[PDB]
Symmetry: C5
Subunit: 362 residues, 5 copies
């Protein structure tokens, strides 16, 4: 029978001794805050500035003794979010972030629900440009581990304690997909406490293990390099007397291998360690460069042939240099793709075992 306006100005009134600046149960045990997040959107992962953009529904549960009411019989009592000025919302800030803008569209995207015993549910929707450091030791295949840290500002560990939720940890939205990565099902909850000269502060963090998909990099980078190496193999069947043809074919394959290697590393930060694509493009470039060196040795042997022919064992030395120049081409035509196939299976199995070692060590 009681009207709701006096009831919802009674608990936050200045005739009441609420004092929203003062934390609950002052001069006592620390407040325990339970947090669960809901990943609404995850994406826009950029490697060159090492950050990613999430959309989260940050839900914070804490108990306030002064907010308890015994008049109304309903337990939930969902409230309007405009009177969220004097409730004592806890301070929370993300340790590694940029941006972090609120959503003010059509209303402030906020949820306030005060239970009968004093439990408060506080939900806010925020997009954060979270910055995570990434390791690029293996660029085509890798398991990145993005770190999201939630800690407090201005309340030490003896006054405010942040804890993860027990029923579930992180709720991902159904149907959420990433175009370049695959989000793993398990998520780590390791809370570490940062120490500062001012004091220690409560901090909880969650880790997402991101598997990079290998379907795009196989089409864009691995197959055109094989096309270039196969073309340099095609140069072996051409006639050895046709010098501009073989020289031009080999030179253009080396040039396009260099430009392809320079263009695949363009969308990457300037890291100072050797990656896997470096190894792949280096061995492919070495293969086309060795093909050009093989033709240069063949044409040098033919040069020695032509100088000793035109100005005495001349016939059998002509035979020896033509037979040797034919033997080099005949053994190269078999030896080049076989050693390339050996390198391919060795590289692929060692990266398969180091990828499985990364997924086993985690």
């Amino acid at each position: 029978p009681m009207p709701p306006s006096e009831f919802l100005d009674k608990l936050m009134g200045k005739v009441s001794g609420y004092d929203a600046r003062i934390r609950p149960n002052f001069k006592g045990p620390p407040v325990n805050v339970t947090c669960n997040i809901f990943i609404n959107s995850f994406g826009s992962i950029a490697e060159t500035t090492m950050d990613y953009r999430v959309n989260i529904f940050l839900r914070q549960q804490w108990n306030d003794p002064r907010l308890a009411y015994s008049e109304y019989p309903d337990d939930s009592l969902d409230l309007d979010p405009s009177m969220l000025d004097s409730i004592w919302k806890p301070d929370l800030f993300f340790a590694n972030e940029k941006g972090a803008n609120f959503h003010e569209v059509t209303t402030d995207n906020k949820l306030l629900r005060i239970s009968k015993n004093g439990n408060v549910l506080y939900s806010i929707r925020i997009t954060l440009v979270l910055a995570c450091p990434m390791d690029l030791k293996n660029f085509p295949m890798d398991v990145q581990t993005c770190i999201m840290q939630l800690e407090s500002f201005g309340y030490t560990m003896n006054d405010l304690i942040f804890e993860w939720d027990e029923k579930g940890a992180v709720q991902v939205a159904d149907g959420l997909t990433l175009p370049q990565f695959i989000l793993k099902e398990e998520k780590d909850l390791r809370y570490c406490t940062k120490h500062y000269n001012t004091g220690k502060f409560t901090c909880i963090e969650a880790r997402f293990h991101l598997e990079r998909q290998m379907g795009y990099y196989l089409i864009q980078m691995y197959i055109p390099s094989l096309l270039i190496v196969i073309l340099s193999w095609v140069s072996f069947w051409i006639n050895m007397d046709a010098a501009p043809a073989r020289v031009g074919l080999g030179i253009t394959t080396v040039l396009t291998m260099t430009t392809q290697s320079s263009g695949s590393r363009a969308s990457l930060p300037k890291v100072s360690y050797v990656k896997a694509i470096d190894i792949w493009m280096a061995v492919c470039l070495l293969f086309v460069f060795s093909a050009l060196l093989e033709y240069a040795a063949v044409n040098f042997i033919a040069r020695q042939h032509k100088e000793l022919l035109r100005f005495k064992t001349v016939e059998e030395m002509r035979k020896l240099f033509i037979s040797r120049a034919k033997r080099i081409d005949t053994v190269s035509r078999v030896a080049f793709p076989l050693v390339f196939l050996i390198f391919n299976i060795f590289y692929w199995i060692t990266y398969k075992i180091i990828r499985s070692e990364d997924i086993h060590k985690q």
Copy 2:
């Protein structure tokens, strides 16, 4: 005869028991909100970040019993938008969005119209960077379906219910055109209700079917690839003894095919499935590569010819290798464009039937 200032401070006065924080007909049936949007601008569709930018006139109709007035005889009573602080505007937020900024130019772009029985018309102009996931299984021709979701924050399904309008659904502005797409005439209205641990929330969505126009991609991508394949066909008429000419022509056609294929995929996200342009550029690249292989086989047969000529059935084996080297060119000159025409009609009709299957399944 009554002056308007007391009348428009009477209904929102604190001597009145309006209480704009409290929802209308509290502790009763849920409020029913009818929404229709007016697409003022639609465009700026970017594939690489998978989002689009709309300009909408969001109109929300709901009934308030406390707002009803019986003194004035006029039914419409358009009001000034500055007193839109205490009216109980409903909470609405878009589920998949970025940005969503209001228009504050020369006034707040808002409309408030309170009917005599209590019906409230609330119109706001907002630009939203709506994020939609897109499928790129067929890149030149495709029918994208952009999804716009409108749901509530902080009021469950038992308290707030969102419904679409019956007289029309989505009003598009007259004369509105898209440079890259064609907006279909019908629009789906399927409302789905999202479930969360806190509770269930009302949500309505509208789907726009966007037909990608095929006029630009025919000029930019399909015809230069045909030019490259026709040039590789031109290489068959050149003399077989002119080895640097045919080798250089074929090598530059393969190189420019590779760079054209790498440059057409630049304005696209790094997806991990095979698209239609992948198939097209792959078959065209295979055609120019097979032309280079055909010349390599011709010059290998001529090599065998020259070695057996210069160091016995020599005349008729010279005839056999010259006749075979002529026969390969003569059959290739006919066989290459005919099999290319066969591939063209097969690819085009299978993509026509899969495009019509996409437009029939919807």
Copy 3:
């Protein structure tokens, strides 16, 4: 003798019955608002997102009967812009716009001047990213018509009427120049009234006719294409037996024509109609491709010559094929630039007459 503070709190005081929420002469004829704009900056015209950025001094003149004062003898009475909260500024918003931010530097850039009879002068400085659709049927030469629409939000045609000024229409700043376009001297004032389900709203618009300057596109695009076609003509004087030279020259001219055509269309939206540069680059590419086809026919005739010479009317058939192979080069050397000159004068005069037809039809 009267001090100014009471006089300027008398007309906007709450002891006065001003009521700035209520429009002037309520329940009567509509308010007539006269608007003239002053183009302070115009520029930053981008084709790929189809919008332009103006800086305008929006001046709005309307009459308020309650604001009239008879105490002071001065007629102008320029006022301070801080008390522009309760004056009843009219609602105005641009129909096709993005951005539209106010200038808050060192003060709010505003002007308020209330005349003695009640005339109010309201000037504000705003930069608007106005979005205009453009037609690219002729890309090098074209006359774009940018549309600026000013309409009201929340006041129908019976309550608010917008009208253009009679003394002048749009004042452009002296010395204002555009690097890529030429602003015409006349400007259209056609007011059209938009109709919506809620009601009809007053709207006035102004059109600027922008002539695209042809000096840059002649240097960047038209002359290098002529350089490529002249180089392909140079290929006719080279010896026909030198096959790698003529083949390589023609192939590199075709390749660079393709890359030049692909690079000139890069700073343009993905439109689906044929433009004028498409026609120009297509005919130039056809010319260099026909030159390569002419050399392929010459070397095919020489191939027939060489096969019938080396394995009977042999001398006179050698004469016939050498004379025909010389005659093809001799007639091509004259016929190629003459038909190119004919195409040039036809293309140029038809685009001159369609440009003058566009400027005559307007």
Copy 4:
């Protein structure tokens, strides 16, 4: 002995008749405002959108008679910047600007100092994206004159007059350097008064003469063009019978000259007048194109030689065509670099005299 709180609420109190909306010495002579700016940062000069970014310390000095105090004996009395709401700051706005955001970091970056007789010192730190039109008649060497205009909004010339400072004009920070330009020591102070239909408004402007440094453009653009022309000269020493070598060398030098000319104009607005780099790249391209034409004439004369040799004064006509084909190469080998050196010294001295004429006319 007087406490400071009553003294600093006495002069701005509503029990005082200060009335900060009303300008000082109302209904009298115009207020005289003295302005000096301090260039803290100058840079980020972009040619393609024709604007530059400054950081200025805007100091405004004006006298207020009502602010005068005779109680305290100190003359300076530096005040706190939070009570800068009611002081009657003068209206000032920059005529050609974008952005112009204030600095709100750790405090509002403001200075307020009220002298004993009524002199007010008002300093604010602002970064402005000032837009200046630039002339690109000579692109490598040029003296740009950036214009910064400071005028008033809403107060005419009879009420507000802006004047420059007498002790110094513009203070540049010590150690301030520009990477691409050199700031001259003198600065022009020409005040021009803008006239509008509403009235005339006071305006003062300052001009900075910016000398473009020529060290970068000599390395990036002038020397690689000389490398290309020297390579085309190297083509003269190669054997005339080696036709693919000389043809390929000349064709690749023409192609790379075209791409170098197209790439140096990329970071520039689309202006419609001929610049100096246009002239330089045009003459260098003409030189490499004439070298290709010279080889085409040599090989045409050799063609006439070969046709009259193989199907009578044959020996002496063979002599005449070989001697003439040798004489063309021998005279070209001397004549090409000498005429290039003549063009170089003529171009360089005429641009030196037109640069000195620009610096003498100013």
Copy 5:
């Protein structure tokens, strides 16, 4: 026993004489402020606009006598950051900065802790786009010294004095790494006082010495240039009669050296001094150009050979020109890589000693 609300409204109440506009110990000695910063994130260093982005925890310690309390026995008394409106926070602003936005996510990221004797701890989290000028005299290896200046606005040296902290200077976060640079362990604390016409202002600065990592530039820039020079060395073994082969190989190596040199300088400001990569690419380009000149001299000597052979000491002059043309190739094949190795060791040791001289002079 005293409740906290009256105690925390007593010290900031208007019944108290706090007067937060007035600085502490007015008309006396200057306030001494001790500042220590905590580098939370450091990165996003861009060379082309010469600025870097930090995340700092700015801690300011100063003593206020009026804030002292003797009632409560606790010494720390951490307070809520909402009542940081009237505390007299000191004015602080960074001298060389852009941006500098506060963090408003979930709360204002602020810390307020008032000690018992009057010591105030004020911590704020800010991201600043700090602009630092950089010297690019040696581009691959260099030690940049970023300067962060903290000074006051509106309080002179006699009223406000800024001092660095004694216990530590700058705290870097543990685990913080930079992808392109290495942050040195020591940091300079040199405070310089800026002088202005208005007065002198306190300023303290901190310098970070940044070592540029050399691992990326060795892979991206130094090794492909060696590949190009090694390929030009490979051109010496090819047959001298094969003129199109050697000419084409040398010409394409010169062309790709030019494009590689133009592409490595793309991500750099337009500086006007010679860098180290300029010297490296210039010597490598000189090496490939000299190889092309060596082949041109060889083919000129062979031209003289062919003209004196075909139209008398003819046999021994044929011997002299063939022996000399062989001797040039034989001495070049040894002399080119040896002088390249000499240049490599000289360049590397002189840059090692100038890098160590830069790290010794600091």
